[PDB]
Amino acid sequence: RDSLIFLVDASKAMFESDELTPFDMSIQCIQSVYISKIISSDRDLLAVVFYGTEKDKNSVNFKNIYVLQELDNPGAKRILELDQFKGQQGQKRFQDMMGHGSDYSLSEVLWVCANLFSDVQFKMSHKRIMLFTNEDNPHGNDSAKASRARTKAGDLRDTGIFLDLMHLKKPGGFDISLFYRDIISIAEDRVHFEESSKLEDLLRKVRAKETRKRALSRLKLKLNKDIVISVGIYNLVQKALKPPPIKLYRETNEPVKTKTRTFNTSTGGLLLPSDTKRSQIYGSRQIILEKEETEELKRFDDPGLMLMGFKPLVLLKKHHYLRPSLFVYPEESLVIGSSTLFSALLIKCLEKEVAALCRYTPRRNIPPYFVALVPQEEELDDQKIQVTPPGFQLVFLPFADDKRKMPFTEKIMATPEQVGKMKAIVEKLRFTYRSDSFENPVLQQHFRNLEALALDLMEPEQAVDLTLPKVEAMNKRLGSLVDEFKELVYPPDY
Template sequence: SGWESHYKTEGDEEAAAEEDLESEDELTPFDMMIKISMISKRQNFSAKQILKLDQFKGQQGQKCFQGLMGHGSDYSFSEVLRVCAKLFSDVQFKMSHKKIMLFTNEDNPHGNDSVKACQASTKADDLRDIGIFFDLMHLKKHGGLFYRDIIIHFEESSKLQDLLQKVPLSRLKLKLNKDIVISVDIYNLVQKALKPPPIKLYRKTNEPVKTKYQTFNINTGSLLLPSDTKRSQIYGSHQIILEKEETEELKWFDEPALMPMVFKPLVMLKKHHYPRPSLFTYPEESLVNGSSTLFSALLIECLEKVVIALCRYTPCRNIPPYFVALVSQEEELDDQKIQVTTPGFQLVFLPFVPFTEKVMATPEQVDKMKAIVEKLCLTYRSDSFENPVLQQHFRNLESFTLYLMEPEQAVDLILPKVEEMNKILGSMVNEFKELVYSADYNPEGKITKRKRNNEYSEEELKTHISKGTLGNFTGPIMKEYWLKKQELLEVLTKHFQD
C-alpha cells in the first residue's frame, strides 16, 4: 500500500495496458513514461467515483488493486511529484491554492536509497517554490523518517501573524476612565463545534423555504404595518403601552465596551471557577492612535505586580454585561527567537454566586472521593475523544451523499467504561454510596416535589386586592390559597347566583 501500490513494473506493463483499455480512465504518454498509474482523472469527485474505491478494501481489495493498477518495489517518489506538478500545470483557470494530500502507511519508502530520497526532497522544494504545498495523512506511522524533509512548516510564521489573520469576534473600547479610551479586538480562540441548523425545504422543488410573519387585524382582517402595533404590559391594574423604540431601549443595558473596575491579586482567581472558555484581547491601532502603547504599558504593569483587572464586559447593546478578569499573558519565544505565545490579555469569564456555592460534605466523604479520583486518573488528550453527535451527523451525511442503505454507526468514545472502572475501584463505590446516601435511599423512586415557601396570609391578599396588584401573582400561588374544596364551591355558587 502507500505509493508502492501506484507503480507498475516492466513485467506487468502489457497486462496492465489491456486492463486500462477497458477502464474509463486511460493513461497519458507522460504517465506511461514514468510508470505512474492514476485511478481517476483530475476532476471533482462524485459519489460513483468514491464508491469505486470500495473495491480496494481489505486483503481481497489489495489483490484487486495490485492486479488492476500494478505494484513494484523500486519506485521513485519524485516521479509521483512530477505527475502532480503536471496535473496542476494543465489547469487553465486560476486557483486560490494548490495542495497535494499524501495518504500513506509507509514511513520510509526509499529505505537506504539516498539518491531517490534526495531527488524527492529536491522536487518537493521545486513545487513549494511555485506555490504547491503538501499535507501528510499518515495512516499508521508519523512520517518522521522520510516525510520530515518533504513536509516543511514555515519558520517565518509566528503566533502573532496567525492571530492577526483571524477575524475578530468584536472590536470594543477599553475605557480606563472617562477621558482615556483605547481600542481592542476580541478574538475567540476556542469554539465549540455544533451541527448546522436544519433548513426547511419545499417538497416539490426541494428549495429552501423562507418564513415570513405578517400581522392582521382580527376584526377586519386587514394587514397591519409595524408602526400600527404596540407592546403592552399589565402592571397591577394599569396597562402600560410601549412603542417599538421603547421596547428596544429596555434591552439596551450599556454601551458595548470593556470597562475595568478594580485590580485584584492573581491568586484570587481559582481554576475551578470556569463557566466557559476564555477570549483573547489584543490592541487595535487603526481606530485610536496610541492604543498599542497604552495597552503594552497596562500589560507590563499587570505582569510585574501579578494582578488581574476585573472588568464589566458588554459585547453588544442588547446583551447583558458579563464580569470578566483580564489575565496578563507574557510573550514567549523559542530557541530560534520565533514567537510561541502572543502577548495580550486572556479575557476570563467570572461565575456568579450560584455557580460557586459549596457542596456540604463531611471529611470522610471528601477523602473517599479523592481516593476514587486518584484510582481513575488517566493521561488526557483532547484529540482522543470525538464528539459522538457530530461524528454520527457526518456519517449520516456520507450515507446520504453516497446513496448507502444505512449509515455507519459512530463509536461513542466518551461513554464511561463501567466494567473496567468497577474492576479498578472494587468496593470503593459502594463505600462512597454508604457515606453519602441514607439507608432507605432508592435511586429509581419517585422524586417528591418541594413545597413552596411563599405563602400569603389573608390580610396580605386583601391588601393586594385593594391596591389592584393581585394580577402580579402567578397561577400556582393563587391555587395554593384556594386549595379547599368547600371554598371553591362557595365561590362558584356565589358567581352563578349573581
C-alpha cells in the same frame, strides 16, 4: 469561500512501516478532514491528486500525475470512493488499478496544480496547496528539474498561491534544509513542526494549519478616554449544535422559500411595524411603548472594552462560571503601535500575577457586562504545536441577580479511615484526561443515519457511545475495595 488542494506521493517508500504505512496514514487523515468539513457545513472546495503515478490522468495530459478528484464541495459518493483505498486491501487495490513508483517532474506537478486553481468557478478567496511525502530532495540527481521547479514555484508564489509540506517520518530523519525550504510559502516569526509518526499528530498539524482565522469583532480597548488600542476578539471554543432541517418540496425535491407576513385580523392588510405598538401589563394597568423607545432604553456606552482597574488573580473564585470565555489579541491593521502596548501589558501583568477588569459592550445597544482579562502565556508541546496561544483570556463575571440561594443543611464529617479507603479507591480509579477524548453521541449517530440514507445503504451503523463508563473493568480494578468501603461506612440497613 476558499479552495484547497492535496498532493500525495506514489514513491515505493510510502508503502513501508507496528506503525501504519505513511500512505494509509495519509488516506485516513484525508478521510477525517473530509468528515470534519462535512460536520461543519463549511463551503470550501477540496481536491486530491497523486504524483509519480504509473498510470496517469489530468487536464493537460502530463505524465505520472493522477487527479482523483477535481476542486469541489465534499460529497458522500466522493468519501466512499476515497475510502475504497483504505488499509492493506485498499493499498493493494490502488497499486493494482494504478501501479506506483514512477518518475515525475515536480515542476509539472505544480503547473497542473495551478491549472486546477485556474479552472475554478466563482472566484474563491484563498488558494492553498498541501504536500504529503517523506522524500527529502527528490531531484538531488537533477539540478535542471530542481532549478526549473524552483523557478516555477517562485512564479506561483508571485501568483499568491500558498504551499506547505507535511513531511512524514523518514528512516534516517527528514531534513528541511536540503530541499522545499527554498520553495514553500514562508511566514514571519523558522519554527516548524517535526516529522509526523502518528495519525493524531498528523491530523493535529494539518487541522491547525488548514483553517483561516475569522475575527468575531473589532473592538477598541480603552485604557482611559485618551489611550485606546485596537484588538480582535475570537471565540476559540464554540458550542457545536445539530444543523436545522430545511423545508423541501414534495414532488421536485427542490428546496422552498418560506416567508412570514403579518396582517390585520379583520382587514387583512399587511401591517407595518409602525402600525403596531409594544405593551406590558403590570400591577393592574397597561403600559404602551414604541419599538424605537424599547431599543433606546437598552443603550449604554458604545461597543468596546473599558478598563476599570487591576485585581490579583486569587480573588477570581473558580465556581463563579457564567458563560464560555473568549480570547483577545492585538489588531494592528486599524491602530499602529497597539501590539507594543498589548505585549508590554501582557509581560508586566504576567510578572505581577494579576488580571485586569473591564466593562464590556459587545455590539451597539446592549447593557454592559463585567469581564476580567486574565493573562495567558504561549505554550508549545514537544511537536511544536501551539497548545495555548499568547494573549488575554476574557472571563465573564456574574451580577448579584445570577446567584441562587441554597437551602440550609447540617455539616457531618467523615473519619480518617473512611477518607483513607476512599483515597485508595480514588487512586485505583485514576486516569489521564484530554479535551479531544470524547465525541458527542447525538451528533455522531445523526450523521451516521444521514449517510445511510444518502448512500441508499438504509441500515445505519450504531455508533458506540464512548461517554459511557467502562463498568466491568472498573469493578475488576476495584476488587474488594467497594465491599470493604460499604461494610465500613454503611450501616447494616440500607
